[PDB]
mmCIF file of C-alpha atoms and ligand atoms in Angstrom:
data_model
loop_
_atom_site.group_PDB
_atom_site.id
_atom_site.type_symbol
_atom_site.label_atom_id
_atom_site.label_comp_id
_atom_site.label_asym_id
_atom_site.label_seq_id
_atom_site.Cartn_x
_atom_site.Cartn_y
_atom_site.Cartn_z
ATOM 1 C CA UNK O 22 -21.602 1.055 -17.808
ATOM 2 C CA UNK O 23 -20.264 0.925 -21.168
ATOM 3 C CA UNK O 24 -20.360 -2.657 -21.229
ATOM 4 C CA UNK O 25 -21.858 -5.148 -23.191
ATOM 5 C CA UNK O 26 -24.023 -8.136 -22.306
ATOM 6 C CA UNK O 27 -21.604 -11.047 -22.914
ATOM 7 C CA UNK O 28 -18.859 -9.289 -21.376
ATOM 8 C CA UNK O 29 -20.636 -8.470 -18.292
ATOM 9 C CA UNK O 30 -21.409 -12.078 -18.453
ATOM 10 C CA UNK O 31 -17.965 -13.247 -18.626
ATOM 11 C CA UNK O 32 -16.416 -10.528 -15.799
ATOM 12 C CA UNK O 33 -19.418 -11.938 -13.565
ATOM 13 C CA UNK O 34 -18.730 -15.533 -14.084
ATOM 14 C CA UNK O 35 -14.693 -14.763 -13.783
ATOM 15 C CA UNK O 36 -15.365 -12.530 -10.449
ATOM 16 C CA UNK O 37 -17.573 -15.188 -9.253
ATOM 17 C CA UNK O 38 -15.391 -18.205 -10.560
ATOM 18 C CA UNK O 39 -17.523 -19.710 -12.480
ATOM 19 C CA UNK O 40 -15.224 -22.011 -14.109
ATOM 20 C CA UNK O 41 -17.027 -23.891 -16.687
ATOM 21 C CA UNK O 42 -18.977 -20.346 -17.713
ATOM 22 C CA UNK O 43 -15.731 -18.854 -18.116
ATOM 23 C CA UNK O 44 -14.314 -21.849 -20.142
ATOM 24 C CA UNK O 45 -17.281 -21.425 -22.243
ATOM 25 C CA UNK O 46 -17.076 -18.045 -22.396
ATOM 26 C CA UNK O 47 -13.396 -17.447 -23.566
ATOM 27 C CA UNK O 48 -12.990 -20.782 -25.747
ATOM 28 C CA UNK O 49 -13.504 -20.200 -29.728
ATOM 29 C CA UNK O 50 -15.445 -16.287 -29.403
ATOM 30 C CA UNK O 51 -14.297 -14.063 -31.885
ATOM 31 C CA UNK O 52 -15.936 -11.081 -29.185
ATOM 32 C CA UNK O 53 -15.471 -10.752 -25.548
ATOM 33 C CA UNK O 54 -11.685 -9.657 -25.588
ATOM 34 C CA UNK O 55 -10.232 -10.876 -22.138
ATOM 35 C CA UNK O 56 -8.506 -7.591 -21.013
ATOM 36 C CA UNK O 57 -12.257 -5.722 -20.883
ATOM 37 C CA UNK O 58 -12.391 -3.913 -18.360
ATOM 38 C CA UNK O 59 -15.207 -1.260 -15.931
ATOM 39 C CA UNK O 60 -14.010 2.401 -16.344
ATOM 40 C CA UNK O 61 -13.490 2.519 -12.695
ATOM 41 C CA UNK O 62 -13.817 -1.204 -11.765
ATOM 42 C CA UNK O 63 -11.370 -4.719 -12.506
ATOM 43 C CA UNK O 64 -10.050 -6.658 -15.242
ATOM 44 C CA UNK O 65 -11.118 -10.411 -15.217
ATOM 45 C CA UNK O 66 -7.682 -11.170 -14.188
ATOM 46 C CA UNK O 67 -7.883 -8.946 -11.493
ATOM 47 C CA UNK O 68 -11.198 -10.135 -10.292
ATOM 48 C CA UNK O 69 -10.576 -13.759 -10.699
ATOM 49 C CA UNK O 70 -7.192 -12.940 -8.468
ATOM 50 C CA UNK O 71 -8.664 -11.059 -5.421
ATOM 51 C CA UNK O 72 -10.867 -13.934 -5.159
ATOM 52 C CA UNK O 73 -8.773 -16.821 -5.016
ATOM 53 C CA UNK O 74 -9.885 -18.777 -8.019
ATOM 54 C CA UNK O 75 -6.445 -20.967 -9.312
ATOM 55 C CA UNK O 76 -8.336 -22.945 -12.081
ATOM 56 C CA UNK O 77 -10.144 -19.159 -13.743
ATOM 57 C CA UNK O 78 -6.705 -17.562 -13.237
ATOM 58 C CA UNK O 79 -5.050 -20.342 -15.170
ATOM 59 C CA UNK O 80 -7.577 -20.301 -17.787
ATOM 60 C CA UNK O 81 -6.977 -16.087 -18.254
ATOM 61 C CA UNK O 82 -3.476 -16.755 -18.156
ATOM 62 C CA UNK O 83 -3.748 -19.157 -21.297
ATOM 63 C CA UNK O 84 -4.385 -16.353 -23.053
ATOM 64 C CA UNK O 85 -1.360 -14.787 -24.536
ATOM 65 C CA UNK O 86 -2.594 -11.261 -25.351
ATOM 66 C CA UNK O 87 -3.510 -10.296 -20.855
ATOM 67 C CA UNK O 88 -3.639 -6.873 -19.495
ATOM 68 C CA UNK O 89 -2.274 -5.790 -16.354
ATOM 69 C CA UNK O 90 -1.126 -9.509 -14.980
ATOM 70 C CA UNK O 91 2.037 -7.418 -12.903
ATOM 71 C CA UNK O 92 -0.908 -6.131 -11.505
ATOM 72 C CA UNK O 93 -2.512 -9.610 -10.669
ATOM 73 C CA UNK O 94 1.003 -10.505 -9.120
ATOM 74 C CA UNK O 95 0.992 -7.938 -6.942
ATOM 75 C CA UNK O 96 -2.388 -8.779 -5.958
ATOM 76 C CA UNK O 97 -1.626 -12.207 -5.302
ATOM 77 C CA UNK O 98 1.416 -11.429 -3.400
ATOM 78 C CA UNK O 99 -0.298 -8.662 -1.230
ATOM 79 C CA UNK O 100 -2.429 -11.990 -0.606
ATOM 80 C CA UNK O 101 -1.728 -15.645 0.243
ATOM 81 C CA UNK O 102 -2.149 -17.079 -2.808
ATOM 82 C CA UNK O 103 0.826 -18.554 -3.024
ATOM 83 C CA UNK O 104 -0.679 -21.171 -5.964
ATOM 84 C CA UNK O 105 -1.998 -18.189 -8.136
ATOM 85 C CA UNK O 106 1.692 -16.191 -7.436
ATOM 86 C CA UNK O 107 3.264 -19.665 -9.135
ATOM 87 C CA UNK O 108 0.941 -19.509 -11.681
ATOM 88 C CA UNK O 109 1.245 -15.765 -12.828
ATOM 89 C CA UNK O 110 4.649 -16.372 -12.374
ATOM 90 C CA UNK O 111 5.314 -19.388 -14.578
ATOM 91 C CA UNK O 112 3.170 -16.866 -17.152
ATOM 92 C CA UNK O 113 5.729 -16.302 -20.342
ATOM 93 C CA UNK O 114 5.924 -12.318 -20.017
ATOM 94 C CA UNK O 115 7.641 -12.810 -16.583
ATOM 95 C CA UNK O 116 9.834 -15.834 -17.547
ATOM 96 C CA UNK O 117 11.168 -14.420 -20.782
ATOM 97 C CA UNK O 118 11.660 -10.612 -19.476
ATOM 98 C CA UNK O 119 13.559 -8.340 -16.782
ATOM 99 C CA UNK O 120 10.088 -7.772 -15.932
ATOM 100 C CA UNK O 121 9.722 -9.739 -12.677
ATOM 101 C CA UNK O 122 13.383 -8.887 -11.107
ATOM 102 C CA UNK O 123 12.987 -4.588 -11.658
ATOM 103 C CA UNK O 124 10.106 -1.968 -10.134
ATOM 104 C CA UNK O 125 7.122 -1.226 -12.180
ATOM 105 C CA UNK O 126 8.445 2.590 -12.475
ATOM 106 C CA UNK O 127 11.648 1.646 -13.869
ATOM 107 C CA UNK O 128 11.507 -1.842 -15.775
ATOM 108 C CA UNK O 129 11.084 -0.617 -19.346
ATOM 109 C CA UNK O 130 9.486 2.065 -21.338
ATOM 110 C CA UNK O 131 6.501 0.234 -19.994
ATOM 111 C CA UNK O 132 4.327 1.574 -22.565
ATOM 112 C CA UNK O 133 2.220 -1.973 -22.002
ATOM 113 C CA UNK O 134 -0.243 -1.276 -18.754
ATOM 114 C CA UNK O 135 1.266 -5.040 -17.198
ATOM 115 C CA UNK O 136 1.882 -3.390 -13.761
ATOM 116 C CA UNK O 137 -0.876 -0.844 -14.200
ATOM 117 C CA UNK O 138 -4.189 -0.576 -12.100
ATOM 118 C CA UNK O 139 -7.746 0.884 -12.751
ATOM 119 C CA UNK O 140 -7.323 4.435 -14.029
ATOM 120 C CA UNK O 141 -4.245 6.332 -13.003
ATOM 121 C CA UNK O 142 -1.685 4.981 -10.685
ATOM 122 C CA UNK O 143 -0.615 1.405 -9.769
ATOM 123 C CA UNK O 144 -2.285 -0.722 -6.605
ATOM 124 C CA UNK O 145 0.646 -0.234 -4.646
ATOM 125 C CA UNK O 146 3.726 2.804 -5.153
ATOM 126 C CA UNK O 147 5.431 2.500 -8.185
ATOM 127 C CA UNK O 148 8.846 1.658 -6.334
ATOM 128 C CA UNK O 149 7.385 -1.510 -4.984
ATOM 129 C CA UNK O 150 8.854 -4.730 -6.605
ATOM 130 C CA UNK O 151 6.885 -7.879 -6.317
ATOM 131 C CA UNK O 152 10.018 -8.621 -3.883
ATOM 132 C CA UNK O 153 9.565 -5.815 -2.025
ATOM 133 C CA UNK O 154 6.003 -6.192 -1.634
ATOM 134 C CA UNK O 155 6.405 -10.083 -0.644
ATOM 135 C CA UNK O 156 9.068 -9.380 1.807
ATOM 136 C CA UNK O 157 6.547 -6.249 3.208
ATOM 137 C CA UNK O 158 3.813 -8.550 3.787
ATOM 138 C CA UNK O 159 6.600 -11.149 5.292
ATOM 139 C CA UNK O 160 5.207 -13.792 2.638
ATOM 140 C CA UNK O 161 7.698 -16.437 3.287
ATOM 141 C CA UNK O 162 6.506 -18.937 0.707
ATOM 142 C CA UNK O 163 6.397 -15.817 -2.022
ATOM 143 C CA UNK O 164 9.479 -14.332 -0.695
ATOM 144 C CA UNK O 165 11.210 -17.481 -1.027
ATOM 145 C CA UNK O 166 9.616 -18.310 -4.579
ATOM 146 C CA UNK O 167 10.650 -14.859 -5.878
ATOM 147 C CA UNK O 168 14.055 -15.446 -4.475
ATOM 148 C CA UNK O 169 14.526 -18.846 -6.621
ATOM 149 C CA UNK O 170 13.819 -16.644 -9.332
ATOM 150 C CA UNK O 171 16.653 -14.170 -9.218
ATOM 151 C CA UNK O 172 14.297 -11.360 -7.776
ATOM 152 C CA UNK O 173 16.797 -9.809 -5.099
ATOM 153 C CA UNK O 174 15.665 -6.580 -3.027
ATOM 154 C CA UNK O 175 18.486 -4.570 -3.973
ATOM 155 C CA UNK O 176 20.272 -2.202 -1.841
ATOM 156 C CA UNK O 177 19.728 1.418 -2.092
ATOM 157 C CA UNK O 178 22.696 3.294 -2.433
ATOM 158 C CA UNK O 179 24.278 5.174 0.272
ATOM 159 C CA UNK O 180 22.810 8.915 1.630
ATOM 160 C CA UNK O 181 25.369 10.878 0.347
ATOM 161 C CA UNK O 182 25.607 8.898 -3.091
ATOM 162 C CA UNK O 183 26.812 11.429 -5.956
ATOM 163 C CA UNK O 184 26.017 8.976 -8.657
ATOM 164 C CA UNK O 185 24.290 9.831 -12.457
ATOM 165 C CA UNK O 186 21.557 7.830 -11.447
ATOM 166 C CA UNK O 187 21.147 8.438 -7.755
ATOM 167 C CA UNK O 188 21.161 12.495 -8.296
ATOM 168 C CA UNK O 189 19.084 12.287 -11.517
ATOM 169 C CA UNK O 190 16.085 10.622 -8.811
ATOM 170 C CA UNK O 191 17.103 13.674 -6.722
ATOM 171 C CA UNK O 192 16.641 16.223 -9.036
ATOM 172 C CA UNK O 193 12.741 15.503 -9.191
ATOM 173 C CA UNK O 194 9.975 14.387 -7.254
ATOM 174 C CA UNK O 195 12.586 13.843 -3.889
ATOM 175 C CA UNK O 196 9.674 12.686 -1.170
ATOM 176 C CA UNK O 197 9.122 9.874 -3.888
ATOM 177 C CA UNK O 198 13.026 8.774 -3.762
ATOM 178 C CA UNK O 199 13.071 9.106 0.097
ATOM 179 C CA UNK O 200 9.453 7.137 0.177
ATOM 180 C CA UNK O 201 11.445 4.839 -2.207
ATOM 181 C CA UNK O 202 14.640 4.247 0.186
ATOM 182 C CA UNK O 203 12.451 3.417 3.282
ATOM 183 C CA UNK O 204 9.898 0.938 1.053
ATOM 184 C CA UNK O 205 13.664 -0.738 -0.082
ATOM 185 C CA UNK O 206 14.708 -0.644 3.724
ATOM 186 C CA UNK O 207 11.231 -2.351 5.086
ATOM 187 C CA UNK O 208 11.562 -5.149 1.982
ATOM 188 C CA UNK O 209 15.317 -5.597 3.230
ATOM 189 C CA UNK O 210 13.948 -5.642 7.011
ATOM 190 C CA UNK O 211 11.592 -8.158 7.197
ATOM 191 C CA UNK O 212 12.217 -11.355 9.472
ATOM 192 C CA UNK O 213 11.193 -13.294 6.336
ATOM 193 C CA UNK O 214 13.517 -11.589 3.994
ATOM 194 C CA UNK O 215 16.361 -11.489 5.964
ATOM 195 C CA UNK O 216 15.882 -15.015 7.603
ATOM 196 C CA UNK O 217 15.872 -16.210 3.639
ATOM 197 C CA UNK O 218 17.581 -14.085 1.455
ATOM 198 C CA UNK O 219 21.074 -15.298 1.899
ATOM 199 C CA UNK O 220 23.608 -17.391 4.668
ATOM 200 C CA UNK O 221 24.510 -15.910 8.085
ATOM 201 C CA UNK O 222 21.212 -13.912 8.503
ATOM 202 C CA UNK O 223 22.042 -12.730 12.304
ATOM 203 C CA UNK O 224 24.777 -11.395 11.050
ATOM 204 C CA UNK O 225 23.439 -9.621 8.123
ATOM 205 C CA UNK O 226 20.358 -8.088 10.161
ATOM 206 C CA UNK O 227 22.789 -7.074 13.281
ATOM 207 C CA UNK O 228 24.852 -5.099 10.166
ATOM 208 C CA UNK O 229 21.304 -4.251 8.638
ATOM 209 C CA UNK O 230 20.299 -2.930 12.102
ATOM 210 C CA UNK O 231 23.674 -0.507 12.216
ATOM 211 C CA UNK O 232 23.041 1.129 8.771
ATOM 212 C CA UNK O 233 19.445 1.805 9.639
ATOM 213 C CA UNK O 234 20.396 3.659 12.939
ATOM 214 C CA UNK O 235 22.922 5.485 11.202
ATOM 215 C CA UNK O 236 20.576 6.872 8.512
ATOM 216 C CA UNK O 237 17.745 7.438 11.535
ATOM 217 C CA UNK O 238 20.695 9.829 12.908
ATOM 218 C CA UNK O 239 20.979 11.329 9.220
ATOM 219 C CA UNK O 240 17.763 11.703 7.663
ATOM 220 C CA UNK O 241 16.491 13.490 11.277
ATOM 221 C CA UNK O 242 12.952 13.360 8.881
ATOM 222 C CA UNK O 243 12.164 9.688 8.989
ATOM 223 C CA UNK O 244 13.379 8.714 12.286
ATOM 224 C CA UNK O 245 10.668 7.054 13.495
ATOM 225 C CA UNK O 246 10.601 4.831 10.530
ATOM 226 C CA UNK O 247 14.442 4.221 10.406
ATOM 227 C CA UNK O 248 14.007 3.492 14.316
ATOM 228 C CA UNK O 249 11.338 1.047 13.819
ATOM 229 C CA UNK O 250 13.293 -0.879 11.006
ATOM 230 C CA UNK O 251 15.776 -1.375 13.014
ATOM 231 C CA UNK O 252 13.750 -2.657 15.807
ATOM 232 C CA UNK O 253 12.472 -5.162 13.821
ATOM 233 C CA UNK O 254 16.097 -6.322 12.920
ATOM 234 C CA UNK O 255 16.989 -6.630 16.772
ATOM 235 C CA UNK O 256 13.672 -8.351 17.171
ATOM 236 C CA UNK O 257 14.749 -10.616 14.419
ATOM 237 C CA UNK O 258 18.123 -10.987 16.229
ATOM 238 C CA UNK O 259 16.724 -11.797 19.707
ATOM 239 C CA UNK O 260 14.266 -14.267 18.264
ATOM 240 C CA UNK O 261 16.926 -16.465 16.181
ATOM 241 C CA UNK O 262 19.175 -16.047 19.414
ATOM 242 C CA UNK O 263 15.865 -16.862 21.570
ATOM 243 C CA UNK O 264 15.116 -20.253 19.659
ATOM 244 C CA UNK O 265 18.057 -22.043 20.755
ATOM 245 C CA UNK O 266 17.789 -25.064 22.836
ATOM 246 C CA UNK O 267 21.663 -26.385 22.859
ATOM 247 C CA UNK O 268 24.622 -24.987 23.659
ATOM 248 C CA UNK O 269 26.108 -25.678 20.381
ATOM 249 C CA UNK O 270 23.831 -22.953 18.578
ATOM 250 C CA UNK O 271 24.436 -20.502 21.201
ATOM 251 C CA UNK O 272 28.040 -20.649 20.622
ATOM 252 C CA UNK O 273 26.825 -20.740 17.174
ATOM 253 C CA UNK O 274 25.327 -17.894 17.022
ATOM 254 C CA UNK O 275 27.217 -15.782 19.758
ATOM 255 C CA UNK O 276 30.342 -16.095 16.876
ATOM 256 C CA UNK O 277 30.241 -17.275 13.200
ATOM 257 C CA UNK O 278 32.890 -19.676 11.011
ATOM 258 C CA UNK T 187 -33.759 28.957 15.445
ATOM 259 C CA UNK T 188 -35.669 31.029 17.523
ATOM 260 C CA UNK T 189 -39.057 28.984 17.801
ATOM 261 C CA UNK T 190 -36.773 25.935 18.115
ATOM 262 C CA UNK T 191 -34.927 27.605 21.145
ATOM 263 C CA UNK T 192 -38.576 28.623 23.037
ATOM 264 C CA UNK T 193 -39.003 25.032 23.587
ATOM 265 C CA UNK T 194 -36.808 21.580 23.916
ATOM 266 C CA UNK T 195 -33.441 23.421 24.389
ATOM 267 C CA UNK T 196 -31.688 20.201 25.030
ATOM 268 C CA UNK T 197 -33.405 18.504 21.772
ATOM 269 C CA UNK T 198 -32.086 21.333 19.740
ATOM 270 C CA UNK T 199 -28.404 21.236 20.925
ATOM 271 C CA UNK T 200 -28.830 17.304 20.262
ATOM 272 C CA UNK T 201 -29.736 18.014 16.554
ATOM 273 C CA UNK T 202 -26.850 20.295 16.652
ATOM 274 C CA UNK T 203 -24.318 17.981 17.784
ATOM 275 C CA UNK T 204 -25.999 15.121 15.332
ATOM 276 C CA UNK T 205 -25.999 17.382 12.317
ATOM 277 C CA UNK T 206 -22.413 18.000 13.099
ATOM 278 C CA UNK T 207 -21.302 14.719 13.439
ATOM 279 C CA UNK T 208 -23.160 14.147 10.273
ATOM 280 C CA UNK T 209 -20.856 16.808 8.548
ATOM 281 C CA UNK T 210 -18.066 15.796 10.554
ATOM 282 C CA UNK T 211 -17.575 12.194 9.155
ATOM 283 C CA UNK T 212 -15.203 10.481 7.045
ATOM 284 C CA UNK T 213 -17.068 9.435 4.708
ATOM 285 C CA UNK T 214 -19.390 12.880 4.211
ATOM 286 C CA UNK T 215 -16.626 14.835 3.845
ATOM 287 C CA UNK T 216 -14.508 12.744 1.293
ATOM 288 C CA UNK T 217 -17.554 12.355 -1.057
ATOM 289 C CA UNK T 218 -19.689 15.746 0.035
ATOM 290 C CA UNK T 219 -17.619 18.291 -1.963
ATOM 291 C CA UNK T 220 -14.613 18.842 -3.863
ATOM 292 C CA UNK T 221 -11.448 19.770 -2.235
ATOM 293 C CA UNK T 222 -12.475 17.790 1.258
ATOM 294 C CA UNK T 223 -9.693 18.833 2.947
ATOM 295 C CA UNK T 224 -10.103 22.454 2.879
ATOM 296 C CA UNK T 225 -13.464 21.735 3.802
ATOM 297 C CA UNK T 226 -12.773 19.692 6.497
ATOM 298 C CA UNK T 227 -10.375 22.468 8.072
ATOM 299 C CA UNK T 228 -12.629 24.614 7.709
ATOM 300 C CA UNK T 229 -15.315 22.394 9.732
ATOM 301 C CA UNK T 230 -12.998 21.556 12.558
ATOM 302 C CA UNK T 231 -11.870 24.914 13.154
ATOM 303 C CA UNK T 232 -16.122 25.750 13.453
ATOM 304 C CA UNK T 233 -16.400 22.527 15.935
ATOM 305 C CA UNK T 234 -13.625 24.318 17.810
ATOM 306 C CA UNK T 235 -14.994 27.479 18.209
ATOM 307 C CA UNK T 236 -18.714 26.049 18.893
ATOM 308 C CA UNK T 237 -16.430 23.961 21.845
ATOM 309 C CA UNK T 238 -15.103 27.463 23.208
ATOM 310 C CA UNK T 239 -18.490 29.162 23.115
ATOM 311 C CA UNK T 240 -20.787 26.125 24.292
ATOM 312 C CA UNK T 241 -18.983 24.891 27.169
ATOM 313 C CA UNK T 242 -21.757 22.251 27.914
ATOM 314 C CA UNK T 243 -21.415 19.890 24.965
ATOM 315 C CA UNK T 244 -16.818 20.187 24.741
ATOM 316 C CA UNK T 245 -16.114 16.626 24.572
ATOM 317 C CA UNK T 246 -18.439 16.028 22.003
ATOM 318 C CA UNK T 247 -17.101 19.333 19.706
ATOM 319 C CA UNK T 248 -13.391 18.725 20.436
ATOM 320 C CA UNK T 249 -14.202 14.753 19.096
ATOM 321 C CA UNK T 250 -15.971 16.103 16.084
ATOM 322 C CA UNK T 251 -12.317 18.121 15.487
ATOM 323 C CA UNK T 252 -10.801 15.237 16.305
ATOM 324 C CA UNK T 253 -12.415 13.522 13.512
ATOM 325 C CA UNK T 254 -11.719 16.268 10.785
ATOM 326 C CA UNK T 255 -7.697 16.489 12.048
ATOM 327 C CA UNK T 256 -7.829 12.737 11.713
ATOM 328 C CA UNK T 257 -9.223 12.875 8.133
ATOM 329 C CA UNK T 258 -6.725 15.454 7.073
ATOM 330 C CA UNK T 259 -3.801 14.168 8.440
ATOM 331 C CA UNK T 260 -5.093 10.789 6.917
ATOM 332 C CA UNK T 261 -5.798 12.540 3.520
ATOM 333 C CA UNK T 262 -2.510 14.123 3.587
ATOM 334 C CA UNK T 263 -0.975 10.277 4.382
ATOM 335 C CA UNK T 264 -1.661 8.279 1.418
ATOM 336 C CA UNK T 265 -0.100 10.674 -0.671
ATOM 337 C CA UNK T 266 3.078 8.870 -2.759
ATOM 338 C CA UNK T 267 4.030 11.352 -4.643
ATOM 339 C CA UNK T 268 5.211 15.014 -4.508
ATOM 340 C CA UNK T 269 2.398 16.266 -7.164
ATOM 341 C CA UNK T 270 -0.097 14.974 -4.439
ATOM 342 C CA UNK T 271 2.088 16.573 -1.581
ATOM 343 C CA UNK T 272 2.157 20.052 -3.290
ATOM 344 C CA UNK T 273 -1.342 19.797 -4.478
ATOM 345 C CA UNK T 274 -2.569 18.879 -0.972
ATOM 346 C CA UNK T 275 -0.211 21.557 0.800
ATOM 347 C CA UNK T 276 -2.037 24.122 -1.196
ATOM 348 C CA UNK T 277 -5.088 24.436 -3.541
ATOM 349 C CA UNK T 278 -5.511 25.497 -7.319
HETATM 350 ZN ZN1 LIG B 301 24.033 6.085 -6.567
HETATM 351 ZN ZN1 LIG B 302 -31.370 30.590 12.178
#
């Protein structure tokens, strides 16, 4: 391990939460930067995020100068820590940048490893937005959190699109645009997502439904995905119908304004 | 394999079908060797002939395949991008 002794003290104390140690550790020490990092293990953000520890991820957070803290949001949304999603999120990269609303593949030049993970690729695939990840894992709490902030699952762009930007995706690396489209489709999808991403939701995932049945007859590669999407947006359908006690929702719901 | 074969027939196949589904795991054949997959073709394809030629033991072989068409369908799977895809598809 090509760490040193204090280091290894502090990633211990951070991965094991030991607050006061850490406090100690990271207060007024000219060493022990706080991005250090295994060659094939976890930063001390990382570590004090897959074990929920909201007082040692506040405390790494303080620190301006923090590697990979996308990567800590995604961990915490992937999780339930909705407290250590809040805190990440009221970090000053996120508030102050276009980082938290776009993927980690196409935010910036990304030069700085903030969505990175150990070695080599990210935790997740690059095309998955904190959003899209929240609305994956139906996080309701994160979904709606990352909602209040602007963060908006956009909609892909139609199948036979013949846009600069939609054919430039095409032109390379197409399974990871197609991989893309149905990661965008499950994040628009979800029962949480769709029940709180904007006003009229039965109506939006009966339309939702259509489009995704339509592209299952298109694609004739992803059916089975496009088919189960879909599902879950007449499942989502049934269930809001379903909950009704009162004749006035029925009607309601069985016609709009 | 001889000497082993006078006596204890049925111990022998059992270290057989052991030793196999010591080769044939997960685990063994993502950290045994490099390129896994190929190797783990190449091992089911063996557990499927051994199934045709034992005819005692063919649950227990056509499992064992089971297991390597599981791992390299599953290998295949994670893949996210098309470097992965054309690397796994075919070798150097
Ligand atoms: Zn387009
Ligand atoms: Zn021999």
């Amino acid at each position: 391990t090509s760490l040193t002794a204090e280091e290894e003290r502090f990633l211990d104390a951070a991965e094991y939460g030991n607050i006061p140690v850490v406090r100690k550790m990271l207060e007024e020490s000219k060493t022990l930067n706080v991005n250090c990092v295994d060659y094939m293990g976890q930063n001390a953000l990382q570590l004090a995020v897959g074990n929920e520890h909201l007082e040692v991820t506040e405390l790494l957070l303080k620190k301006e100068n923090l590697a990979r803290i996308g990567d800590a949001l995604l961990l915490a949304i992937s999780k339930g820590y909705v407290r250590i999603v809040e805190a990440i999120l009221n970090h000053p990269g996120f508030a102050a940048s276009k980082r938290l609303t776009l993927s980690p593949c196409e935010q910036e030049l990304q030069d700085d490893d903030f969505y990175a993970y150990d070695e080599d690729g990210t935790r997740f695939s690059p095309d998955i937005t904190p959003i899209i990840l929240a609305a994956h894992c139906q996080k309701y709490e994160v979904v709606h959190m990352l909602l209040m902030k602007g963060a908006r699952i956009e909609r892909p762009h139609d199948y036979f699109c013949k846009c600069g930007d939609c054919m430039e995706k095409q032109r390379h690396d197409s399974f990871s645009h197609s991989r893309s489209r149905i990661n965008a489709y499950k994040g628009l999808a979800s029962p949480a997502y769709l029940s709180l991403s904007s006003e009229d939701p039965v109506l939006t995932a009966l339309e939702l439904s259509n489009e995704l049945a339509k592209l299952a007859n298109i694609e004739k590669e992803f059916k089975n995905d496009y088919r189960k999407l879909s599902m879950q947006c007449k499942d989502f359908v049934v269930g809001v119908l379903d909950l009704c006690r009162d004749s006035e929702e029925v009607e309601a719901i069985l016609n709009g304004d």
